[PDB]
Design a protein around this ligand. Sequence first.
Ligand SMILES: NC(=O)C1=CN([C@@H]2O[C@H](COP(=O)(O)OP(=O)(O)OC[C@H]3O[C@@H](n4cnc5c(N)ncnc54)[C@H](O)[C@@H]3O)[C@@H](O)[C@H]2O)C=CC1
Ligand SMILES: NC(=O)C1=CN([C@@H]2O[C@H](COP(=O)(O)OP(=O)(O)OC[C@H]3O[C@@H](n4cnc5c(N)ncnc54)[C@H](O)[C@@H]3O)[C@@H](O)[C@H]2O)C=CC1
Ligand SMILES: CCCCC[C@@H](C)NC=O
Ligand SMILES: CCCCC[C@@H](C)NC=O
Ligand SMILES: [Zn+2]
Ligand SMILES: [Zn+2]
Ligand SMILES: [Zn+2]
Ligand SMILES: [Zn+2]
Lengths: 374, 374
Amino acid sequence: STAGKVIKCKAAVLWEEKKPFSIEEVEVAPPKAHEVRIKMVATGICRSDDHVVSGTLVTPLPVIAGHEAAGIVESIGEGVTTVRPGDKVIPLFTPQCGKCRVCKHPEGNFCLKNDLSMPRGTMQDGTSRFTCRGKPIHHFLGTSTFSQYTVVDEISVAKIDAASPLEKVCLIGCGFSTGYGSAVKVAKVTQGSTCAVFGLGGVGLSVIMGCKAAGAARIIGVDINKDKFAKAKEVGATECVNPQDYKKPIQEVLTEMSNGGVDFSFEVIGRLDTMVTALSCCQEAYGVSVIVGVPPDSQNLSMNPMLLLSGRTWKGAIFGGFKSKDSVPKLVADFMAKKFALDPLITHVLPFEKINEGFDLLRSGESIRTILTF
Amino acid sequence: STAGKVIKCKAAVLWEEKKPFSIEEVEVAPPKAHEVRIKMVATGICRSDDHVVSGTLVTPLPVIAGHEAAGIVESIGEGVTTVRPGDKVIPLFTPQCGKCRVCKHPEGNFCLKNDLSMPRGTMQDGTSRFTCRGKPIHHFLGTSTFSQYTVVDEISVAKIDAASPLEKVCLIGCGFSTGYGSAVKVAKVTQGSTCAVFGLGGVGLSVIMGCKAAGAARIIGVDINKDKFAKAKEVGATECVNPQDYKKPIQEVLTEMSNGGVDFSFEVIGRLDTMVTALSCCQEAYGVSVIVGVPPDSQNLSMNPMLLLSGRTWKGAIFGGFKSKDSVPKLVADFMAKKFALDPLITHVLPFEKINEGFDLLRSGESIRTILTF
Ligand SMILES: NC(=O)C1=CN([C@@H]2O[C@H](COP(=O)(O)OP(=O)(O)OC[C@H]3O[C@@H](n4cnc5c(N)ncnc54)[C@H](O)[C@@H]3O)[C@@H](O)[C@H]2O)C=CC1
Ligand SMILES: NC(=O)C1=CN([C@@H]2O[C@H](COP(=O)(O)OP(=O)(O)OC[C@H]3O[C@@H](n4cnc5c(N)ncnc54)[C@H](O)[C@@H]3O)[C@@H](O)[C@H]2O)C=CC1
Ligand SMILES: CCCCC[C@@H](C)NC=O
Ligand SMILES: CCCCC[C@@H](C)NC=O
Ligand SMILES: [Zn+2]
Ligand SMILES: [Zn+2]
Ligand SMILES: [Zn+2]
Ligand SMILES: [Zn+2]
């Protein structure tokens, strides 16, 4: 019944950096050609949403953030062919247009239609579907899921299993898939290897799940918050280390523990120093290090290229390297088939209107994923 | 006739940085257990030997440099099994002990017995076989080929085909195998791909040959010395660009030329800035960039890790990733079967006594490889 009509609903608007989200009445326009309007069912609080608040990630403000979510299609614009009203869907913060050089490449997934490289904070057409008191509100990564309703381009949404539990599978929209894919697809962790995972939040735990799935023999978790260690061990870490406990640099500790360096390391925090530490702690001749964390905007790291000349491989990836529209439905199918677990990531569940309590929990160190429900 | 005796012969000794080599009489001790004394036949002048002179590459002085060579075994120490007197051999500046974790790894080649990471400038037993003016003289990478005779450890020498032409195959001891393998083994260049090669000296020309062997569709040579272009095209470059001809930075030029970035880029110069530029010019989502050049000692580069987060792979390698003792004889066999060419790399041939002229030719931009004959 709301098809073709403006919807008035509640959304969490970020008006300014370093402020709480503000629950506002917003107007959500109907979808234009090749756009899809979605009724939100669940959305995760990812550290990347916090990065918009802290200014770590720069994107036009004011904004509706949120990018890790699942919902049900309320209506479709003209020409939409991949979803229908009533379908369960996951919004895709990395699009899959299927036509650019990256979408056509066997390995690439950073589709050229992304809104990450030079953020505009709009729909593909350069405009917004959100207004608050006659003021346009920016979109975030073409998703914007901190809202009862959002509108996304068709290349930024995937249809998923009609029977999937949205309060869990929303994590496949970012944290799980990023961490799991970073291990299994980007690093290509091998059976019997030794892995080191820096940062034991939702994404790092998912990296551990991937390392375990790949048959790593040793998975060393690294975090300065020792409260994160229990859960890391539950999901597959064989040992955990807190750099604050040592009188020497943790790259040295890890090199000693691993008898000369690890096979695979992962930076899942977002600090320049831990990116270089994670590179250094992998074995100098054949080690691989994968950057997953998002560091502060426009800041460069410093490193000695001899670390690479000896034979190391350094790479990064977005969304675990998964081509998003192809992979998300398959990952949901795999979850339904009990191929991996999502409950270990979910520590808190709150109604959407308690979003700020959810961010308080993340910032305090107490939560992994808070899921916000509608 | 010389077996078991100290040999008096000529060598090019480097007494101090930034000075000419001194051609003088040295005493070369007989080989101890598991060592091999070699009569040198031919040695190339590689930019890395010049880096020892300039202090770009730090190794203990005084030293007998030279590492790209071929010769004939004069005698063997007790317990040597892999070569015999009279055998043609290539010294291996990257050893292959066969026993360490790197030698046993399918991908690694930077054997832990190397003298590169923490240079001692000795034999494996921590002593020197060279005396000059009554003083011990350091070895260089366990090779030291700027001498009529040298002594190497058995893990640092490979027996090659008895019919091979030593005045050519000395290049397999460094510059050819390094560039070729950087393409075919390290980057794993694919059929139909676009490559960019920064630096068109002997090693860069060998990278081109590797890209051609791999079936690259486009191979773009980059050099600030336009005199290098003609040879680069002869060996497979489809285009050459001089950064000095353009107003925009060359990574921008190359990104444009390649319709969004190259599949594979190679830094084959040894500058921090071109390492970052070569990384930047590979396609952001699936590009691969290989560092081959040796930069100034102890200096760090600065880069934005967003270059990696979008999906790029950055790696480096020593000696083209080849396990040295396994690979060198096979490379010689392939050369004898004309699977690749060495003549295009050889622009000058001089007697050993004219070593300083050979270094002048390199420094002036005139030569690719000068081969010194004994
Ligand atoms: N590449 C991609 O596509 C994606 C990147 N991200 C990024 O991944 C990172 C992790 O995200 P979440 O798991 O949601 O964050 P989180 O904040 O829950 O986890 C980070 C963990 O790092 C630990 N930590 C902080 N400083 C540390 C230090 N100096 N040493 C060791 N541990 C330290 C914290 O105690 C925390 O447990 C963030 O930067 C986020 O923006 C997340 C999803 C997608
Ligand atoms: N990784 C490894 O195992 C090895 C590394 N090396 C290193 O590879 C590098 C190349 O060796 P060669 O080919 O013997 O040296 P080379 O000196 O003959 O060639 C370097 C080329 O770079 C060009 N060049 C200089 N500045 C440039 C700039 N700003 N932009 C573009 N081109 C520029 C020069 O004109 C020259 O043609 C050296 O640093 C050497 O030490 C060599 C062999 C083994
Ligand atoms: C790991 C750095 C490799 C550099 C090897 C050079 C010095 N060898 C011969 O040119
Ligand atoms: C290339 C950097 C990728 C970062 C992607 C983040 C912002 N998205 C989800 O958390
Ligand atoms: Zn996220
Ligand atoms: Zn695309
Ligand atoms: Zn070894
Ligand atoms: Zn060399």
